[PDB]
Swiss-Prot record, chain A:
It is found in: Nucleus; Chromosome. Disulfide bonds: none annotated. Essential factor involved in transcription-coupled nucleotide excision repair (TC-NER), a process during which RNA polymerase II-blocking lesions are rapidly removed from the transcribed strand of active genes. Plays a central role in the initiation of the TC-NER process: specifically recognizes and binds RNA polymerase II stalled at a lesion, and mediates recruitment of ERCC8/CSA, initiating DNA damage excision by TFIIH recruitment. Residues 83-242 form the Helicase C-terminal domain. It is linked to Cockayne syndrome B: A rare disorder characterized by cutaneous sensitivity to sunlight, abnormal and slow growth, cachectic dwarfism, progeroid appearance, progressive pigmentary retinopathy and sensorineural deafness. There is delayed neural development and severe progressive neurologic degeneration resulting in intellectual disability. Cerebro-oculo-facio-skeletal syndrome 1: A disorder of prenatal onset characterized by microcephaly, congenital cataracts, facial dysmorphism, neurogenic arthrogryposis, growth failure and severe psychomotor retardation. COFS is considered to be part of the nucleotide-excision repair disorders spectrum that include also xeroderma pigmentosum, trichothiodystrophy and Cockayne syndrome. The CSA-interacting motif (CIM) mediates interaction and recruitment of ERCC8/CSA. A C-terminal ubiquitin-binding domain (UBD) is essential for transcription-coupled nucleotide excision repair activity, interaction with RNA polymerase II, association with chromatin after UV irradiation and for mediating the UV-induced translocation of ERRC8 to the nuclear matrix. Homodimer. Binds DNA. Interacts with ERCC8. Interacts with RNA polymerase II; interaction is enhanced by UV irradiation. Component of the B-WICH complex, at least composed of SMARCA5/SNF2H, BAZ1B/WSTF, SF3B1, DEK, MYO1C, ERCC6, MYBBP1A and DDX21. Interacts with KIAA1530/UVSSA. Interacts with ELOA and CUL5; the interaction is induced by DNA damaging agents or by inhibitors of RNA polymerase II elongation. Interacts (via WHD region) with RIF1. Interacts with SMARCC2/BAF170, SMARCB1/BAF47 and the neuron-specific chromatin remodeling complex (nBAF complex). A motif (CSA-interacting motif (CIM)) lies at residues 255-267. This is DNA excision repair protein ERCC-6. Belongs to the SNF2/RAD54 helicase family.
Curated annotation (Swiss-Prot), chain B:
One of its GO terms (molecular function) is ubiquitin-like ligase-substrate adaptor activity. Keywords: Chromosome, Cockayne syndrome, Deafness, Disease variant, DNA damage, DNA repair, Dwarfism, Nucleus, Phosphoprotein, Repeat, Ubl conjugation pathway, WD repeat. GO terms for biological process: DNA damage response; double-strand break repair via classical nonhomologous end joining; positive regulation of DNA repair; proteasome-mediated ubiquitin-dependent protein catabolic process; protein autoubiquitination; protein polyubiquitination; regulation of transcription-coupled nucleotide-excision repair; response to auditory stimulus. SUPFAM superfamilies: WD40 repeat-like. The gene is ERCC8. This is DNA excision repair protein ERCC-8. SMART domains: WD40 (SM00320). Disulfide bonds: none annotated. The keyword Nucleus applies. WD repeats lie at residues 33-73, 88-129, 133-173, 177-216, 235-274, 281-321, 325-363. Substrate-recognition component of the CSA complex, a DCX (DDB1-CUL4-X-box) E3 ubiquitin-protein ligase complex, involved in transcription-coupled nucleotide excision repair (TC-NER), a process during which RNA polymerase II-blocking lesions are rapidly removed from the transcribed strand of active genes. Following recruitment to lesion-stalled RNA polymerase II (Pol II), the CSA complex mediates ubiquitination of Pol II subunit POLR2A/RPB1 at 'Lys-1268', a critical TC-NER checkpoint, governing RNA Pol II stability and initiating DNA damage excision by TFIIH recruitment. The keyword Repeat applies.
Length: 268, 365
């Protein structure tokens, strides 16, 4: 922010998208939140890991119950995938290069399958890909514009890799650690980015994703309370309790300066 | 003495010669107050005294009964014989008196508009010279045995605090951050001192019987490790390995921060070089201390040969720092002496003991 003018970067945009659950996806979410397992967890009986993981999987896609054009991970069954198809269409028609992120490897595989269903030229990288081949792949994608979309797991997709070659970035799935999201979305807007970039972070409105978004908002508030300034406004969008299982879909000093500073410290 | 005046007038000898010769001759002839008497205000023993650095006029004093008294030393009366009045006081009725004996009290160097004080109630209050109100406090988890502000730092304003915990705290007065601790010691820390020469070199000593010269900028514990026998081998950072065989409850850098004098409960004193911690084998004989808490002493400045005024039982014992001669003994107290200060302007000594007295030793003739 204080170096951009002295560095001549292009413009950036931070649009956040609030998706709508599909009928099947909404039904699955409603079924699961009405299950007995979540009731047991809310009673403290069982570990909270399982319910959270299941909800994340559902919101990413109804892959719990693998439902032609009905193969496992069919794009129209998850609203986020429909919106992603729309955006990929628009950007491919706009001749832009897109960056596609995801937290989970399996949803990355479903996304790859959908991309193969389309004609888009993709190029994927996760922990599975051999390390020796990774930097070559980065060089390739930053080299040729033929590859339209780049698939990544955020745990390797972020973390110091330079992907100025891409133009557009979409964050499919949120996470508990906002730093992951920031690193991913900063994979594009770096030194050498010669085109305007815009960020699209996908959240299923009124679901677990919105609650995780609130939590990580509170986290940026905590961090900015010390790194940027101490006058940080109090987080108020949520009280951050354990009711995120619910479905709420929308619709030299001279001995005077020292004394004065110290009094000021004492009068807070 | 007339010869010095002749030489000085003729330009034979630099005035330096007369100045330092006369200062020494005054220090040798020191003896109990012919022409002073310190007003009595303390109900208990006096734990500390601190004559101000600039102009050397006012003298704080911290009693064992929680009261601080601020003195005036200049003979404002017209008589040859006078008394040192008390200007103000943090009495027992002040809303901010310490609940217990005051263990250390120190003027703010570079400006008399402040003074710091510490006490066994685990508090280090930072007063105002003029308004006389505690403009801060640092509350600690264990009793505060001693503190010391750097005497030369124009940049930093840290305040080393040696408490009954094995962690040397470094509070700051610029925005107050009492988090810092120097890891490495092993038991209580009975004394701490800042170098007068180098800004950041802090030397602390602990009841586990070793002194350790830290550098407070580094991140590598301590620099030097003081060892009685200064053998070939080296050690890591601990309080172990016996600078003295018993508790070390005393520290004083000599006037210009080269060497380092340490008294300890094993009835010995040792002069160590402070560049390499090299015990310089000066000895001083058998100096009696058995104080269970900090032991304050001082060294003269502006004298031809450098002395040290070390309490010795109820007597102040004067030694020559570099030669170990016992110049004399001052015998004027009735209980153990606990702190002595030196007035470098006129070569005068003030001494405070458990007997609730602050005596003045002035040169005779």
């Amino acid at each position: 922010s204080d170096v951009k003018m002295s560095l001549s970067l292009p413009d950036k945009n931070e649009q956040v998208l609030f998706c709508r659950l599909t009928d099947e996806q909404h039904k699955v979410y409603q079924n699961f939140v009405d299950s007995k397992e979540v009731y047991r967890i809310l009673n403290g009986e069982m570990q909270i890991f399982s319910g959270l993981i299941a909800l994340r999987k559902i919101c990413n896609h109804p892959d719990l119950f693998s439902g032609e054009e009905d193969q496992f991970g069919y794009w129209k069954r998850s609203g986020k995938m429909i919106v992603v198809e729309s955006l990929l269409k628009i950007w491919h028609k706009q001749g832009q290069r897109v960056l596609l992120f995801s937290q989970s490897r399996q949803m990355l595989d479903i996304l790859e399958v959908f991309l193969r269903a389309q004609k888009y030229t993709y190029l994927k990288m996760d922990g599975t890909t051999t390390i020796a081949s990774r930097q070559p792949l980065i060089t390739r994608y930053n080299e040729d514009t033929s590859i339209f979309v780049f698939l990544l797991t955020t745990r390797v997709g972020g973390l110091g890799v330079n992907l100025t070659g891409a133009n557009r970035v979409v964050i499919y799935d949120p996470d508990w650690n906002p730093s992951t999201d920031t690193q991913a979305r900063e994979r594009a807007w770096r030194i050498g980015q010669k085109k305007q970039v815009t960020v699209y972070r996908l959240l299923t409105a009124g679901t677990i994703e919105e609650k995780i978004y609130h939590r990580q908002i509170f986290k940026q508030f905590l961090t900015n309370r010390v790194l940027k300034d101490p006058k940080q406004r109090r987080f108020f969008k949520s009280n951050d309790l354990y009711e995120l299982f619910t479905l709420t879909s929308p619709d030299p000093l001279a001995s005077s300066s020292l004394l004065a500073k110290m009094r000021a410290r004492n009068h807070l | 003495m007339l010869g010095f005046l002749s030489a000085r007038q003729t330009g034979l000898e630099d005035p330096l010669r007369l100045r330092r010769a006369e200062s020494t001759r005054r220090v040798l002839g020191l003896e109990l107050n012919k022409d002073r008497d310190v007003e009595r205000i303390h109900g208990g023993g006096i734990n500390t005294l601190d004559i101000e650095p600039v102009e050397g006029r006012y003298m704080l004093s911290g009693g064992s009964d929680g009261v601080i008294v601020l003195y005036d030393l200049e003979n404002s009366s017209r008589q040859s014989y006078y008394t040192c009045k008390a200007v103000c006081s943090i009495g027992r009725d002040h809303p901010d008196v310490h609940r217990y004996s005051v263990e250390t009290v120190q003027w703010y160097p570079h400006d008399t508009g402040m003074f710091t004080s510490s006490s066994f109630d685990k508090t280090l209050k930072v007063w105002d010279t003029n308004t006389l109100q505690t403009a801060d406090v640092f509350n600690f988890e264990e009793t505060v045995y001693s503190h010391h502000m750097s005497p030369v730092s124009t940049k930093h304003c840290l305040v080393a605090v040696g408490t009954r915990g094995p962690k040397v705290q470094l509070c700051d007065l610029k925005s107050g951050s009492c988090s810092h601790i120097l890891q490495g010691h092993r038991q209580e820390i009975l004394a701490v001192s800042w170098s007068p020469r180098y800004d950041y070199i802090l030397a602390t000593a602990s009841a586990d019987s070793r002194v350790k010269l830290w550098d407070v900028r580094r991140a590598s514990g301590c620099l030097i490790t003081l060892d009685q026998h200064n053998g070939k081998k080296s050690q890591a950072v601990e309080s172990a390995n016996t600078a003295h065989n018993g508790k070390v409850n005393g520290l004083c850098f000599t006037s210009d921060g080269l060497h380092l004098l340490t008294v300890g409960t094993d009835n010995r004193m040792r002069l160590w070089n402070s560049s390499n911690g090299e015990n310089t084998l000066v000895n001083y004989g058998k100096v009696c201390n058995n104080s269970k808490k900090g032991l304050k002493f001082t060294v003269s400045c502006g004298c031809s040969s450098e002395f040290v005024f070390v309490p010795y039982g109820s007597t102040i014992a004067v030694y020559t720092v570099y030669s170990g001669e016992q110049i004399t003994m001052l015998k004027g107290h009735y209980k153990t002496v606990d702190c002595c200060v030196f007035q470098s302007n006129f070569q005068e000594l003030y001494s405070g003991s458990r007997d609730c007295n602050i005596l003045a030793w002035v040169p005779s003739l």
